[PDB]
Amino acid sequence: DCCLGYTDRILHPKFIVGFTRQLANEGCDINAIIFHTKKKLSVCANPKQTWVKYIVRLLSK
Numbered sequence: 001d002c003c004l005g006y007t008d009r010i011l012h013p014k015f016i017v018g019f020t021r022q023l024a025n026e027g028c029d030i031n032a033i034i035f036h037t038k039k040k041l042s043v044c045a046n047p048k049q050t051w052v053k054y055i056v057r058l059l060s061k
Contacts, residue, residue, distance in 0.1 A: 003032035011043070015038070016035045016036070017036065019034060021033060022044075031047050032046070032054050
C-alpha cells in the first residue's frame, strides 16, 4: 500500500473528494499525496507540485 512513484496523469479537481498523506518516515520510502474519488479510486501525487498543493488547498476550504 505504498505509493512507489507519482501519477503524471491529469488531476481533475471535480472528481476528487479528499486525500490521504503518505510520509516517508511512517513505513513507505517517499512522501505522497493520495487523492481519492467518490468511487474511492485513489491516485498517488507528488506533494511538491504546485497543482497538488492547490487541490489540497481547495478541499480544505
